[model samples]
Target chain A: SPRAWQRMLSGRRLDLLDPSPLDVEIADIAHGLARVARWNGQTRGDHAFTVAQHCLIVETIFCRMCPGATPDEMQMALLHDAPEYVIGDMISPFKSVVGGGYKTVEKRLEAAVHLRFGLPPHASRELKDRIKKADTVAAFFEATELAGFSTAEAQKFFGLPRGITRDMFDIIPLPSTEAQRLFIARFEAIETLRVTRTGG
Target chain B: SPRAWQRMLSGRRLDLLDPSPLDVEIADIAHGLARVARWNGQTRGDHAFTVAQHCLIVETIFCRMCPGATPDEMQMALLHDAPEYVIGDMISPFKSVVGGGYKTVEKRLEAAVHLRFGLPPHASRELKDRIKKADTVAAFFEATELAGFSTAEAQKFFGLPRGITRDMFDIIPLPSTEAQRLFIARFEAIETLRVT
Candidate 1:
């Protein structure tokens, strides 16, 4: 049907302009995210630092930042960059030029993914603030260690978030496949925990 | 360490030269493949006809070709292109040009992916023939419907396989997102059926 939508392996058509929860799948999100490189494959490693790995790190940081977070919050942290799995990770400068059109599609896809996995379409203010903080912390480490940004430069841009120490985060980059596995494993663990809690 | 390996998100470094099943995950395979285009984005669609969709169709055709196949064989069909999740789906001419280096990496990755899910590193001859037949049938449909090849042209290239009726195959291309979901769903369904 024209070129407005993507046809899925399931024979379902997904409209990128208006994605639906029905079109979303955790496997799909995991797959796309695992392969999509962060820093546009410019990281210091044999493999590109993928968003799947980045998201996994972000979720870990979120948990450390808020140890008592619910499974739901953890899911949000894990899937924060889920939209990038489909559209790719656009660097901040490019995203600025692309502007609202990019954000609109990203948010649409994000909401669909969230709803498919039982997350709120939009995070609450408290959750948002925490996620932002965790995300910045991840950025700080990624910039300095992998992307070749000095500590001073990272601090100037990303700002030094409190509660992050050198020992707290493992800034080493992983292979995209490994990152994909960890991301899926974490998601499954969280899902299992959520189900057990709800069922009990 | 060197350029020979890839480090996973789980903190496991995978040696590409000798990949390990410990390094493979179905989620990763499905994810990468769903986004990796089959015809290198040359197909006629808003989104590229992703390998994830192609693999799913291939598996369906395999099931139809061998209705009473074992779970192991079915799994093999499903993951036939799992290696392409990393290396990508190179067309036949390009593959020949790239030569052994590409095939080596692909085979290593394929072995790891297969071992991860309990399949043999390489398919047996019987299984290989069936998979080849299914793959060709899928190609026949994909070429005619999406890649702008006529039926006669596709038959000449992909070879017309027996037992495939027009209604059995949905020749239309699907979006990567939808294809990813279906691929995962089929995998899960097969796993469940295998278990039960």
Candidate 2:
């Protein structure tokens, strides 16, 4: 058989099909996501708009939308696209067609990644819904601002955001390197808070 | 359902599970491999030794080892780690454990990538063996020179290279930007020859 598996910069090999939580590293996710551009690198800026920055945008919006949300829950929004680290971002048109097969790989990686941290391997339905809501809102802004989507098109695709405005986010994409460090920093802060709340 | 796809910089969507050959882009692969570090970024250099550069090393070594080789076969060597552009380079210990499940995703992607570039989706055993020999030789040099594997340890792990010497390669890892461009330039050069 041909060689299989990818090596992370963190000295771990993550199994995409049947990943273990031990294989997921924040540094790998952050670095990979930082380099993995959003909107297929079709977005504006000197740098490609990255998954790392997009997650930060969703994280901010999610926390604002849910005033009572826990730090762990905030991580859900932050890592919504974590699988994109290994599986480069794909267009939804394709994402939908390969649903069953594609989702298994993504879900497996998501479960491993979420489990790597203290989060539930699979998010609760309510948590998933809330995060998706925030994700859609963030997308509207991202689409209209960076991607070529019109405000009308974006709102139709992403829905009118609830309890938020475009002004809520800086929205400017940073260099991938900068985005990588910032993502790690946010992860650390959220993890610290989650542990503190649990008195760990 | 939670979003399951990733958008490529090329404005093409590459489905990892059921990837299409047309979805693969050399630009995406070069940019990604340029940034995906080898030895988990543990190597000594101003920039992490990138899979992009590593592929170049293997390609060069392969060309030297088989002077009569075709450009198409050279491409096989260069893109050996093309999947690493998406999967990231992995360690052996971890790679060994996740065999069957991991192999499917990787094979699927590899087939798509190679097919997109006008190569066979799967390499013949002889081609695979030749490319692997070049790859192992590259690793021995890379391991000892950049990744801190003692020369003795690298020889044991990677085996002594055949028909090549240590001094044949410059072997210094370049900045990711430089590596990215160099990888593309090499790919284009090899491709142009293949077409000619």
lDDT of each: 0.70, 0.74
Give the alpha carbon lDDT tens digit for every residue of B156-188 in model 1.
768876988757756465655577688899888
Error of 2 at B156 (Å): 8.9
Q: Write the per-residue lDDT of candidate 1 for residues A78-193, one digit (tens) a residue.
A: 89898764555544533333446556777788788889888899789899899988988998888777765666767876887688775775567665456667889999999987
lDDT tens string, model 2, A1-200?
22245555455766556778887888778767776555644555545566788899999999999999998898888998898766556545444433365567778888888888878988899999999888888888987787656666666677777679878877887866688788999999998889888893
After aligning candidate 1 to the native by TM-score, how far in Å is the CA of B137 from where it should be? 22
Least accurate stretch of 10 residues (summed lDDT) in model 1 chain A?
A1-10
Please give the DockQ score of every candidate, comma-separated.
0.02, 0.09
| Candidate 1 regions with alpha-carbon error over 4 angstroms | A8-13, B1-196
Enumerate residue pairs that collide in model 2. A6-B89, A6-B90, A7-B88, A7-B89, A7-B90, A89-B6, A89-B7, A90-B5, A90-B6, A90-B7
DockQ of candidate 2 against the true complex: 0.09
